[PDB]
């Protein structure tokens, strides 16, 4: 179950990945990635669905272009848990390799 | 390509080819909402769309949760609807049908 | 998981549901090539096979050219076919189904 | 049409693509790849399948695991042709962005 807000493992958590925003009362975090053009912002959300897909967690994501607006929180515990990080930790490493 | 207007009779004749999908309000762009039966088909799904896209040069807008792809389309150096919107939709609707 | 072994009794029944595939050579692996009408479909296809691979950890050998891609199955850190190989297959079947 | 062995315009291109082999009479270009994991083999692959239908120009490759294994030239002219280079190159910068 659910990670409470500026709990002491949360804010540990974040701490790794910085770029991201939290919610409104922690309930979530989100962070925009911007690439070159589509063909990079693709070859992005195709690491990060090869790896959703394993470890069954999926983001909410919105694709415009060379836009992708993710915003992350574990569903089925309704706020964040310890997978929305290592989700948004392979995001930003998988981002990376673009800059 | 020039703007297409709203309720204008080659707009609508398009539309009629690709019934699914809602215009906005007023007539600025289409949507539609897929639902899959799991992540793997949604992505196999946007994969051939992505393909598409980037051929034909005119991308969606959308929003994907787990089997859900919500998309909304229209040229935006047009600021409005156009052909290339109504190609893209139909497509997808082909992609889509497979997973019926 | 156990190396599965040649004419098998366990084998020949899985390989009952997945008839199009040829077994080696002799029985080490197994072979099937798909054909789609282009590469977009053909990469729609693989696409979703990618997702469920590193899912299972378990991963094809395939070759692709254009519309046909060509598959060869069997557990490396076996050398040879056990249950894994004929999961994916059958997956892959299913995934190809769609475009008939 | 199809770029002749050792020929001038072909050695050219060549230059822009060094870790390529040529084939053995120069009828196509060989190069083998090798990432990490499948996980980036595929993010890898992805950006190449979004630039090939586009440029209607496609791959030979053998992907295993975290290896891809391309073999490119024209089939239409039976040799090596412009396409195949701009090819490689793409391949190339998005195989770059892995280490
Ligand atoms: C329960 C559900 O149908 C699936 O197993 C998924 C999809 N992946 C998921 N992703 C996220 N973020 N929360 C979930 O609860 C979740 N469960
Ligand atoms: C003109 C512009 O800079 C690019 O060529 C793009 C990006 N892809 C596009 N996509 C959409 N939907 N409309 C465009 O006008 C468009 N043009
Ligand atoms: C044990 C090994 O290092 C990896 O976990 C992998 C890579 N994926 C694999 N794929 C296949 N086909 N057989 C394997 O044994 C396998 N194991
Ligand atoms: C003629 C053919 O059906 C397609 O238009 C393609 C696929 N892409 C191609 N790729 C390569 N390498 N050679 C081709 O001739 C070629 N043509």
Redesign the interface.
Known sequence: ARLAANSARLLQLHKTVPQWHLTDGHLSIKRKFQFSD???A???M??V??????VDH????????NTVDVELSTHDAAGLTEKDFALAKFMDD?AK??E
């Open positions: 589509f063909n990079e693709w070859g992005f195709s690491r669905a090869l790896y959703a897909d394993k999926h983001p909410n994501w919105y694709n415009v272009y998988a390799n673009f």
